[PDB]
Amino acid sequence: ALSLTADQMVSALLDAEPPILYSEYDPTRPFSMMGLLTNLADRELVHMINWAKRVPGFVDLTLHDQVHLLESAWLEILMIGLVWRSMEHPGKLLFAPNLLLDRNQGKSVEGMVEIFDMLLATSSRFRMMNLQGEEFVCLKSIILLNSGVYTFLSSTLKSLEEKDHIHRVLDKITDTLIHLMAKAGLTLQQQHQRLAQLLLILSHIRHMSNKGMEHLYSMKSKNVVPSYDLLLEMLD
Amino acid sequence: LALSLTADQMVSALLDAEPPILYSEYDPTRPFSEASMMGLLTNLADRELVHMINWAKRVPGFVDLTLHDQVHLLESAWLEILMIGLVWRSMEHPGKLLFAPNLLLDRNQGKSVEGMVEIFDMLLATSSRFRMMNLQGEEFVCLKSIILLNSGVYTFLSSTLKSLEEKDHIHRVLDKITDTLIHLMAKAGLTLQQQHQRLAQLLLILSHIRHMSNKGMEHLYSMKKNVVPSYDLLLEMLDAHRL
Ligand SMILES: CCN(CC)CCOc1ccc(/C(=C(/Cl)c2ccccc2)c2ccccc2)cc1
Ligand SMILES: CCN(CC)CCOc1ccc(/C(=C(/Cl)c2ccccc2)c2ccccc2)cc1
């Protein structure tokens, strides 16, 4: 599937997009913050596995490596999705269409408003850059392929082939991002510049995931961080 | 006035601003298993940080920022910058980390402190990736300046007119480093496709470097020691003389 043209790559990613889910609270009852966020994330994760298997090249990998990639990336992917759908809602986070929250509403869990603030800034940055949908799906696929690629625990022949593949798929997505920017009329300089600005935002998204992963682990709750086996059970 | 700088001028500036490679301070005539490995890394890092401040002030456009914003950027970036330095000078030493010329450690030596072999393994993998990519010195200095300028830019948390202007400037300087990276690549004869593919490959490694810094910072905080540089320390070091 690295024979795909740039336009075929975009279409495939656009097709693979997960749906927008709703929060599960009774809207007729008075308005747990973590509870709502957790159920939302749970349900999104199932759809994320579905999406991942539709990212060109992903199912070419071993099941083990697919799990490793998702294990490393799942919160980054949830967060970029959140930031994307929040883009046109300054100062708020659209967790769900029935759950649009501001930073003050985040101040009811310790350490949450700090995370909310980081997400809001990323959304602002997306707005400034006028991030497009076709660019977003590319960046999201890059996260899936990239975040875990430096932490493969082996140098077996197969693992070398797997890493080679991952980097070839990533190069294809780079080629596609550039194409999108060419299609929109950006100059060559502008193209490289925007590529860089987009990819640099991924470091901040990594950062936000790390801070959030710290929170989930501090809870000392058994099922809160997805196990290898859960991911394995879903992917197979 | 560093936005007028050319691509070759930008590289030259950055190469000239490079900090020195420091040596570990242990008595080499003394038994090795005495020394605390966290002790050695901490002292090395302390000394490196001073040189980092002076390097930062020589990154084109960095001293055009407010002192508060300079501090914020370094507060965010300092461990990423130490780590990319480490990974760079380890590039030519497979399976080892060259903390200093007289302190070249493997992953087994990192098993000294619990939780540290995991970080060593990530650093080693980064170094291996640099090796695979045949990372050049001029590309290295560009990436390191990008880390300095980019890592804290999303967390200023001021929307004053001044802060807007500061962020605009940071992104203009970043754009210029991007132009510089591309120029280097075109100079080396890479096709346009190869140029944008390698730019992306290099920038994606920065996310893993962020990751490594976060895991490292988790450790330093876990110690419950003054081991994380305070704002006031960074301010004290940056807010200097000219006497
Ligand atoms: C295995 C079961 N797990 C993961 C699915 C339960 C899910 O735990 C959570 C997963 C994600 C989030 C979350 C955010 Cl922003 C968050 C993370 C950490 C600390 C504070 C906030 C978020 C929720 C929805 C969309 C985007 C982000 C919260 C709990
Ligand atoms: C007192 C304030 N700071 C000074 C920065 C002290 C900060 O202590 C340390 C700073 C850096 C390192 C360090 C590594 Cl790789 C590390 C970090 C966390 C856990 C395990 C290892 C490193 C050292 C030198 C070069 C590259 C990396 C260790 C202690």
Q: Give the domain ranges of chain B.
A: 7-238
| C-alpha span between B43 and B39 (Å, rounded) | 6
- Helices A6-15 and A157-183 sit at what angle, rounded to 10 degrees? 100
Give the method of determination.
X-ray
Nearest to A200 among B122, B201, B203 (CB): B203
Q: Which residue of A has its CA nearest to B197?
A: A171
| C-alpha span between A77 and A70 (Å, rounded) | 9
Closest Cα in chain B, distance from residue A109 (Å): 20
| C-alpha span between B64 and B57 (Å, rounded) | 9
The amino acid at residue A137 is V
CB-based contacts of B51: which residues, under 8 Å, 6+ apart? B19, B20, B22
Eight-state DSSP code of residue B22: P
Calculate how far, in angstroms, residue A137's C-alpha sits from the geometric centre of ligand 2.
36
Which of B120, B203, B204, B212 to mutate to test binding with chain A, by most A CBs within 10 Å of its CB? B204
**Which segments within chain A are labelled E, that is strand?**
92-96, 99-102
Name the nearest CA neighbour of A207 among A141, A121, A85.
Answer: A121
**B32 to each of A18, A110, B26, B112, B172, how far by Cα in Å?**
56, 44, 8, 12, 48
Which element (helix H / strand E) includes A60? none
- Helices B161-187 and B7-16 sit at what angle, rounded to 10 degrees? 100
Eight-state DSSP code of residue A155: -
Closest Cα in chain A, distance from residue B55 (Å): 22
Which element (helix H / strand E) includes A217? helix A188-218
Three-class secondary structure of residue A5 per DSSP? coil
Name the nearest CA neighbour of A170 among A49, A17, A55.
Answer: A55
| C-alpha span between A39 and A78 (Å, rounded) | 13
| C-alpha span between A144 and A68 (Å, rounded) | 10
Backbone phi and psi for residue A65, each to the nearest 5 degrees, phi listed first:
-65, -40
| C-alpha span between B59 and A22 (Å, rounded) | 47
The amino acid at residue A133 is G
Q: Which residues pair with B100 in a beta bridge?
A: B103
Name the nearest CA neighbour of A193 among B4, B176, B206, B148.
Answer: B176
Q: Starting from the CA of residue A38, give the closest ligand.
A: 1
B53 with B237: CB under 8 angstroms?
yes
| C-alpha span between B237 and A35 (Å, rounded) | 45
| Resolution (Å units) | 1.6
Q: Which residues pair with A102 in a beta bridge?
A: A92
| C-alpha span between B98 and B90 (Å, rounded) | 5
Cα dihedral B59/B62/B68/B74 (nearest 10) = -30
Q: What stretches of chain B show up as alpha helix (H) in DSSP?
A: 7-16, 37-56, 67-89, 116-133, 137-150, 161-187, 192-222, 231-238
User: Interface of chain A against chain B, CB under 8 Å?
Assistant: 117-118, 121-122, 125, 142, 146-147, 150-151, 167, 170-171, 174-175, 178, 188-189, 191-193, 195-197, 199-207, 210-211, 214
Nearest to B210 among A151, A193, A207 (CB): A207
**A44 to each of A56, A79, A179, A234, B55, how far by Cα in Å?**
20, 11, 30, 13, 45
Residue B48 marked in a binding site? yes
Q: Starting from the CA of residue A222, give the closest ligand.
A: 1
CA-angle at B213, arms to B211 and B217, nearest 5°: 120
Specify the fold of A6-235: Retinoid X Receptor (1.10.565)
Calculate how far, in angstroms, residue A177's C-alpha sits from the geometric centre of ligand 1.
29
Residue A229, both tokens: 């086996």
| C-alpha span between A103 and A124 (Å, rounded) | 14
Closest Cα in chain A, distance from residue B181 (Å): 10
Residue B55, both tokens: 């390097």
**A97 to each of A20, A22, A24, A124, A126, how far by Cα in Å?**
8, 6, 11, 19, 19
| C-alpha span between A148 and B95 (Å, rounded) | 20
- Helices B7-16 and B137-150 sit at what angle, rounded to 10 degrees? 90
Q: Which residues pair with B96 in a beta bridge?
A: B106
Which of B154, B176, B206 to mutate to test binding with chain A, by most A CBs within 10 Å of its CB? B154
- Helices B67-89 and B137-150 sit at what angle, rounded to 10 degrees? 150
8 Å CB contact of A175 and B197:
yes
List CB contacts (< 8 A) between A151 and chain B: 122, 125
| C-alpha span between A77 and A41 (Å, rounded) | 11
Three-class secondary structure of residue A30 per DSSP? coil
Residue B97, both tokens: 């980390």
Which of A2, A149, A150, A180 to mutate to test binding with chain B, by most B CBs within 10 Å of its CB? A150
**A167 to each of A144, A164, A174, B13, B196, how far by Cα in Å?**
12, 5, 10, 32, 14
Name the nearest CA neighbour of A204 among B170, B235, B52, B203.
Answer: B203
Measure CA B125 to chain center: 16
Name the nearest CA neighbour of B79 among B117, B40, B45, B106.
Answer: B45
Residue B85, both tokens: 């330095």
The amino acid at residue A227 is S
- Helices B67-89 and B192-222 sit at what angle, rounded to 10 degrees? 100
Nearest CA to ligand 1 atom 24: A41
Backbone phi and psi for residue A118, each to the nearest 5 degrees, phi listed first:
-70, -40
Parallel, antiparallel, or unpaired for β A99-102 and A92-96?
antiparallel
The amino acid at residue B16 is D
List CB contacts (< 8 A) between A192 and chain B: 178-179, 182, 195-196, 199
Specify the fold of B7-238: Retinoid X Receptor (1.10.565)
Residue B33, both tokens: 């298993």
DSSP string across B41-77: HHHHHHHHHHHHHHHHTTSTTGGGS-HHHHHHHHHHH
Nearest CA to ligand 1 atom 3: A224
CB-based contacts of B117: which residues, under 8 Å, 6+ apart? B107, B108, B110, B111
| C-alpha span between A70 and A82 (Å, rounded) | 17
Q: Which residue of A has its CA nearest to B183?
A: A189
Three-class secondary structure of residue B98 per DSSP? strand
The amino acid at residue B155 is T
| C-alpha span between A97 and B32 (Å, rounded) | 61
Eight-state DSSP code of residue A57: T
Nearest CA to ligand 1 atom 18: A212
Nearest to A121 among B155, B179, B195 (CB): B155
